[PDB]
Design a protein around this ligand. Structure first.
Ligand SMILES: CSc1ccc(CNC(=O)[C@H]2CCCN(c3ncnc4nn(-c5ccc(C)cc5)cc34)C2)cc1
Ligand SMILES: CSc1ccc(CNC(=O)[C@H]2CCCN(c3ncnc4nn(-c5ccc(C)cc5)cc34)C2)cc1
Ligand SMILES: NC(=O)c1cccnc1
Ligand SMILES: NC(=O)c1cccnc1
Ligand SMILES: [Cl-]
Ligand SMILES: [Cl-]
Ligand SMILES: [Cl-]
Lengths: 467, 467
């Protein structure tokens, strides 16, 4: 990896565009003003993997110089300025980054981190690294969207069952194949694990161990489960034999069995319902069969599967008046799930008097891929510069869009007297009217100065209903 | 990178699930049946970076064993199967992959690649690597959606100007900050460069040189350009000074200057139009000023910018009857651009008699992030197995969704008598009624066996209008 080749191409040219005698460029990131509050997560990964230590070498400078000469068909690369960092700082970036603690849940429109150069010669460096830092939008957005789904699950589980038992296993990550790269898979899976413990995206485990850390051996867990190949390989007329083999191989742990290869309704009513019923009603409460539909309208299919199972298996009514399958039998809907369809399904279940205890959800592309930087309006902008020794507040205020207006001056984040948050502009945090700045230095002059464990991040990101 | 920890968690338990004495599992990838045709691109990256050579070691087996013991809370990992590959094949995968040539443009619902194990003990390995291989959906989808935008641009450039000059520079990649990882940025940028030569996502250059290669030193190009920080740092009252400094700095090369920091209309009509007009009109055809709006309704902003500039600069009428700014002045719309708004903008310009020669487009999130595996229904499924020495044709036919039905048996890709594509099922390619199979072996037993340069991929992906 070469940080000199890790920026948008136009930035290579920006050192020539800043006002002359500029000794400092100070910029900030926010999720501009439902997604009212966002989980701040993922900067520590970027700091450690890409920004810390000796990130400039003579070879990296020469390689960048050669690439940019061809890419621009002109010599515009700031070799002198990069060689300065190499010679003066042993290739360590003279940048200070201050950030809200990871896991913190912050309302939209607040400063989440700031970046500035610590050596006047490196005024151009602050926004060189915008591109790599702005990619924090992704773990922020996955963690936030996963937490909003946890909010919906908690509200329906509490109403239907009177408690939150099992909440942290109700949204399982199925997204490994549906994201755009191996690296995205690990980042996204780790962001989902801020909120839940169920994942099949194995890449998230190694990322959390390497850059965050947990007291437990692993941060996420899974169970044996079939796919269409392991059912259909038996031949169409032998679906029952496949189901029998698989539940017998995994008789003492939970096992998920995709049941829609040919006819989900026939499989639940006849194969599970009658032919293999003796192998289901014998199972432990710690080792249920989890029937998995995987096609059709997600709501209609869940409701019809539950209706079928409720007629073939003993059903109890819990203390809130909702129907509950026996403890050896559960359902997972892992097709077509995103935050909108998750809400539709749990509301449809509630209307038909089915407890949310009966169901869990798997989500793949909806959880990790169908998200953009535009969802929370993640943005990085310069708000303060020093030119000719005088600080000036800088901002953008497009006439066409008031929403794109940026903040002015030196920023700080504070608790309000009512316990909310406020971002103070124009250096007003220096007046000390609002208690301590919540931004902490996390990176300075090539060194990670403050780190958080994954357990702390999870604590910071808890729901109020959990609290 | 560990291939043992690079699959969905449920796949680890699969070896147990298949029918006893299964010696072969054969699977295939398609973009299931506007996006009628898809560009096949990106498999060669995956084969080289992740699948070739010695990918199993004793340390990787031990690492996977220890992770999965905690992740499943049980010892379900197939240590013996992985050890077999390490001992018998020096850790090279006994898999054969056949694929259509990269850059080929293939209608939906055709086999694009197939995967099978070459050793009977490794029947479980075919679908182990599903997760890694299915991530090819992303470069396929970026390349396809980029090509569909090229078709729109070509249609409207041809109609408004009579030729396709400049087509390959008309959609520029702005997506580096808006994708979910560094790895995704390189993959996606490379897939856009199958169809265009303009890009700010520098990561794509290194990936193309390393895994595909080009005759030219670099596959893509850029120009100097401003961002809001380099304008707003001068202070709001000094926008004109920033513009004058930047244009002067890059007088002999094309320069893009974002002009919407405060008032885009005021900047075009008063600052560019009157105050700095002398600086603009003196510029060469090879180095025009490119005015860049970045906010408001994209079609409304483009039309109003062009009306303003048409009244301050000398407009001509080209041979098709469309208006043309002088050659030293162009526009780039780099906000809100996606396949749908691109179409809206070029059609609105045509209706207002504005030649598409006047404009280019910058796309970030829409080009590389706002895409999912569901757009082209990219899907990997087992179609053939051998059990007890007998081949059987296998598939999934969900009752609720006919679209999810998968193909049966051994597959092959052919040309029809009219020159179209057909996928033959059930081994029927062997009858030779449709000539030789189109697919080529690209991977066998740990080695890449056939490969394509980026120049060949570009040629294969050309538009008919270009041919
Ligand atoms: C469908 S609901 C269910 C399922 C399994 C069980 C069997 N173990 C249990 O009960 C204990 C053990 C740990 C998980 N515990 C859960 N408690 C509520 N809900 C859960 N879902 N879940 C899940 C979700 C997705 C996947 C792929 C696998 C598992 C785990 C859930 C509590 C009970 C209820
Ligand atoms: C807005 S139109 C324009 C722009 C610049 C020029 C100045 N050089 C040129 O003309 C020669 C030089 C190479 C590219 N050539 C192009 N030929 C048609 N169209 C193009 N667009 N384009 C672009 C796309 C994205 C970015 C960030 C910068 C530039 C390059 C375009 C031909 C002329 C017309
Ligand atoms: N475990 C599962 O059922 C699963 C995992 C990944 C993708 N789809 C399904
Ligand atoms: N070159 C540009 O104008 C650019 C690049 C990346 C993102 N936005 C704008
Ligand atoms: Cl060095
Ligand atoms: Cl599956
Ligand atoms: Cl910009």
């Amino acid at each position: 990896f070469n940080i000199l080749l890790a920026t948008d191409s136009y930035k290579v040219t920006h050192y020539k565009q800043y006002p002359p005698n500029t000794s400092k460029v100070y910029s900030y990131f926010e999720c501009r003003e439902k997604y009212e509050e966002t989980v701040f997560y993922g900067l520590q990964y970027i700091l450690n993997k890409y920004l810390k230590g000796k990130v400039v070498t003579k070879e990296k400078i020469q390689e960048a110089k050669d690439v940019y000469k061809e890419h621009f068909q002109d010599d515009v690369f700031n070799e002198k300025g990069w060689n300065y960092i190499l010679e003066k700082y042993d290739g360590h970036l003279p940048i200070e980054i201050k950030a809200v603690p990871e896991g913190f849940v912050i309302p939209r429109g607040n400063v989440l981190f700031t970046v500035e150069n610590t050596d006047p010669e490196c005024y151009w460096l602050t926004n060189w690294i915008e591109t790599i830092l702005v990619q924090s939008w992704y773990p922020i957005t996955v963690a936030t969207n996963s937490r909003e789904q946890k909010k919906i699950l908690a509200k329906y589980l509490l109403e239907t069952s009177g408690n939150l038992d099992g909440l942290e296993y109700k949204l399982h990550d199925f997204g490994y194949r549906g994201v755009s790269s191996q690296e995205t898979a690990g980042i996204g899976a780790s962001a989902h694990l801020v909120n839940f413990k169920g994942t099949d995206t194995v890449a998230g485990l190694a990322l959390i161990k390497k850059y965050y850390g947990t007291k437990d051996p692993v941060p996420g867990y899974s169970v044996p489960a079939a796919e269409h190949s392991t059912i259909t390989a038996w031949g169409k007329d032998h679906e029952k034999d496949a189901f029998e083999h698989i539940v017998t191989q995994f008789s003492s742990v939970p096992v998920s069995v995709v049941s829609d290869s040919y006819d989900i309704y026939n499989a639940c009513e006849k194969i599970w319902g009658e032919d293999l019923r003796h192998l289901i009603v014998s199972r432990s409460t710690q080792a249920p069969l989890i029937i998995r539909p995987d096609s059709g309208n997600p709501l209609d299919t869940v409701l019809k599967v539950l209706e079928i199972l409720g007629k073939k298996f003993p059903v109890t009514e819990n203390s809130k008046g909702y129907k509950l399958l026996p403890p050896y039998l559960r359902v997972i809907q892992g097709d077509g799930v995103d935050i909108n369809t998750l809400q539709e399904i749990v509301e449809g279940m509630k209307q038909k008097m089915w407890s949310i205890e009966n169901i869990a959800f798997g989500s793949g592309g909806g959880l990790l891929q169908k998200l953009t930087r535009d969802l929370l309006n993640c943005s990085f902008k310069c708000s303060y510069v020093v030119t000719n020794g005088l600080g000036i507040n800088v901002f953008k205020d497009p006439v066409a869009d008031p929403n794109k207006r940026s903040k002015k001056g030196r920023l700080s984040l504070h608790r309000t007297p009512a316990g909310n948050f406020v971002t103070l502009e124009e250096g007003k945090g220096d007046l000390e009217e609002y208690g301590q700045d919540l931004l902490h230095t996390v990176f300075k002059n090539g060194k990670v100065t403050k780190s958080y464990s994954f357990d702390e991040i999870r604590k910071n990101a808890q729901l109020n209903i959990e609290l």
